[PDB]
Short mmCIF file of C-alpha atoms (C1' of nucleotides) in Angstrom, two decimals:
data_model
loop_
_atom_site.label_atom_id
_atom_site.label_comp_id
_atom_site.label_asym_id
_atom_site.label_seq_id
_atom_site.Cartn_x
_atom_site.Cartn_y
_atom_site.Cartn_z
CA UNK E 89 56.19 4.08 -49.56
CA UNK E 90 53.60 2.58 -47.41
CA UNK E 91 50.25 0.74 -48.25
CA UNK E 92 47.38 2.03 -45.71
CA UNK E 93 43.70 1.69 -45.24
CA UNK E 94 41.61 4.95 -44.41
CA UNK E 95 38.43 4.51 -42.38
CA UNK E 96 35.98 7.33 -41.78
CA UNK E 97 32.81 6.91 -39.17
CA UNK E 98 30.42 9.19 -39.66
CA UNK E 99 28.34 11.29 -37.00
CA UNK E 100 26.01 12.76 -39.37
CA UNK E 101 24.68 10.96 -42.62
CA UNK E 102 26.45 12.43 -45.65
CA UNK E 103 25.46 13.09 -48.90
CA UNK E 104 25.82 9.88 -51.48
CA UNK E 105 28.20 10.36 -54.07
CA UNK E 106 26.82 10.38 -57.13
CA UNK E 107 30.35 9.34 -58.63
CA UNK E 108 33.76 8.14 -57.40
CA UNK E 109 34.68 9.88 -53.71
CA UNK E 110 38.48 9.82 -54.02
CA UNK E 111 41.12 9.80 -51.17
CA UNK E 112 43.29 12.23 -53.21
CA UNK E 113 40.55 14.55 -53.73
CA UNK E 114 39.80 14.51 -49.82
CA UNK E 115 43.29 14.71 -48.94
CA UNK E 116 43.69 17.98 -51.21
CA UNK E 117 40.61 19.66 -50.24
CA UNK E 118 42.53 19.59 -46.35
CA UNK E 119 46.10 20.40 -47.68
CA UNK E 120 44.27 23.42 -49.90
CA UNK E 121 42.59 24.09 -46.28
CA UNK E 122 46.06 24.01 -44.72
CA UNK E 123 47.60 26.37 -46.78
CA UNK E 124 44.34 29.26 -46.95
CA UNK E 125 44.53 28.92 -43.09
CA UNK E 126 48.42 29.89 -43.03
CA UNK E 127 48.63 32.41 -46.35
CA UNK E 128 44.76 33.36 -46.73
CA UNK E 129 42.07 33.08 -49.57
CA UNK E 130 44.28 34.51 -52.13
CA UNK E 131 46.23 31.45 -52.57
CA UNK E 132 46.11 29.84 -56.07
CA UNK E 133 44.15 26.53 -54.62
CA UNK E 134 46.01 24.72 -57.85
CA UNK E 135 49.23 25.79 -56.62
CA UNK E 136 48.83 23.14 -53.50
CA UNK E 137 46.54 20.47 -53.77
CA UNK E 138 49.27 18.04 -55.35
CA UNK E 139 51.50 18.31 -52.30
CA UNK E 140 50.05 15.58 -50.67
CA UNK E 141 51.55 12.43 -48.86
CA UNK E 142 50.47 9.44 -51.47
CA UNK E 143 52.57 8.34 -54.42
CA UNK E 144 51.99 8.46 -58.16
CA UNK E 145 51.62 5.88 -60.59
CA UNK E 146 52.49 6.91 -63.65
CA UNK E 147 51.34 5.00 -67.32
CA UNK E 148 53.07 4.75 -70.61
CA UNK E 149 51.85 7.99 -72.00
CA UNK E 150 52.27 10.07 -69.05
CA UNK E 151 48.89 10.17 -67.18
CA UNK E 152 49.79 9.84 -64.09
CA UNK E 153 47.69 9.40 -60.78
CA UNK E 154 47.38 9.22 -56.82
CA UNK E 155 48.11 5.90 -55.46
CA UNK E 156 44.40 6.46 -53.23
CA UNK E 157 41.51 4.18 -54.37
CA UNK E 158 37.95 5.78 -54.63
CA UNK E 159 36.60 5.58 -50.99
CA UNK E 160 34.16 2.41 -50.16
CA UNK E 161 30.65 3.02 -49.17
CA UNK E 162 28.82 0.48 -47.23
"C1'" G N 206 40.50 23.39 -54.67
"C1'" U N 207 35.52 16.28 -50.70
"C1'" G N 208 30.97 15.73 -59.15
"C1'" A N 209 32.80 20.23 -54.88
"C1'" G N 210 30.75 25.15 -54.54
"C1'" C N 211 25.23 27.95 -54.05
"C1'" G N 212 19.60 26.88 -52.60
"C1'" G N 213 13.22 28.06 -46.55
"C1'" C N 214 8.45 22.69 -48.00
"C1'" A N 215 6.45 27.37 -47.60
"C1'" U N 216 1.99 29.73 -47.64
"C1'" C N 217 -4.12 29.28 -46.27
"C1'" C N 218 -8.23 26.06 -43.22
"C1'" A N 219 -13.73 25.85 -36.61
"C1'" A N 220 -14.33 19.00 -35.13
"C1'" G N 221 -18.91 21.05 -35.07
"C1'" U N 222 -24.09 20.36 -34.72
"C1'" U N 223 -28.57 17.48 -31.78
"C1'" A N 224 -29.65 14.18 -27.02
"C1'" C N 225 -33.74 13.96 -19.13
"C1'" G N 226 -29.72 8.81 -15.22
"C1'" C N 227 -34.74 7.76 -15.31
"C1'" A N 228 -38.64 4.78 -13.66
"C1'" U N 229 -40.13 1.22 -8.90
"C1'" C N 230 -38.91 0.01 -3.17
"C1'" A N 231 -41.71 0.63 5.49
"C1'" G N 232 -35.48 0.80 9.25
"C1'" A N 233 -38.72 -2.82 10.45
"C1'" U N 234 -39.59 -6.75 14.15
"C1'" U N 235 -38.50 -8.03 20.61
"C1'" C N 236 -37.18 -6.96 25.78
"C1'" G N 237 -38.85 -3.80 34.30
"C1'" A N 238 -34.08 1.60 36.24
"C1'" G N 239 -34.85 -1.95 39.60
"C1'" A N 240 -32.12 -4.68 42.39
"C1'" C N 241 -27.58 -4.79 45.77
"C1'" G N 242 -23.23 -3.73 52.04
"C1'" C N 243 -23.21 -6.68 57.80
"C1'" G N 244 -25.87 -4.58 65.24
"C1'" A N 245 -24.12 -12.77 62.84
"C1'" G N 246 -21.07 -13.51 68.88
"C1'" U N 247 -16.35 -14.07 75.21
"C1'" A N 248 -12.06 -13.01 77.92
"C1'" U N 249 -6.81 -13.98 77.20
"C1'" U N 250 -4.00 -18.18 74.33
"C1'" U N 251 -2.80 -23.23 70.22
"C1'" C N 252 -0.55 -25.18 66.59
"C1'" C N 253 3.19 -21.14 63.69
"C1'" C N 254 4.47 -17.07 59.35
"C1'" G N 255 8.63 -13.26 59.42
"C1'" C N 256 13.94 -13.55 62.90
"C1'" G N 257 12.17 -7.99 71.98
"C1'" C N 258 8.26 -6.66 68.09
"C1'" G N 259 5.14 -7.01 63.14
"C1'" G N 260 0.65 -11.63 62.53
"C1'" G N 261 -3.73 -17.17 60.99
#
RNA sequence: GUGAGCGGCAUCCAAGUUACGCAUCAGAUUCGAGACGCGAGUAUUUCCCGCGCGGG
């Protein structure tokens, strides 16, 4: 519902990812962080990582994904 | 549930042995403790400096 552009600076150097570093995937690492901080470590961390603020795009046969491109390195 | 999560560059090792700051070189040439303190000039006022008195 609104296009965005996520920057990151860095204070430490991080690891290189040796594949695609997704937005979703950081964005439901924190929510999954969110909801062990208010319940505890006995969540279900399936249960809440797709409750995240990004739309889907959804193909003909289903597969559906996170409007959040693969973060840039430079 | 960030191709995530988990993971000691760590252990051991002599900078040491030997080596003359030494040989040579005038602090010399000149010159006095021996000289230097008044017995030096008349009588009573003259031009003047500060102002009766200090004073050329």
């Amino acid at each position: 519902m609104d296009f965005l552009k996520v920057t990151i600076n860095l204070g430490s150097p991080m690891v290189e990812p040796g594949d695609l570093f997704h937005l979703d995937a950081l964005l439901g690492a924190l929510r999954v962080s969110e909801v062990r901080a208010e319940l505890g470590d006995g969540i279900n961390p399936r249960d809440h990582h797709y409750d995240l603020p990004l739309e889907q795009y959804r193909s003909r046969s289903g597969q559906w994904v996170f409007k959040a491109s693969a973060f840039h390195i430079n």
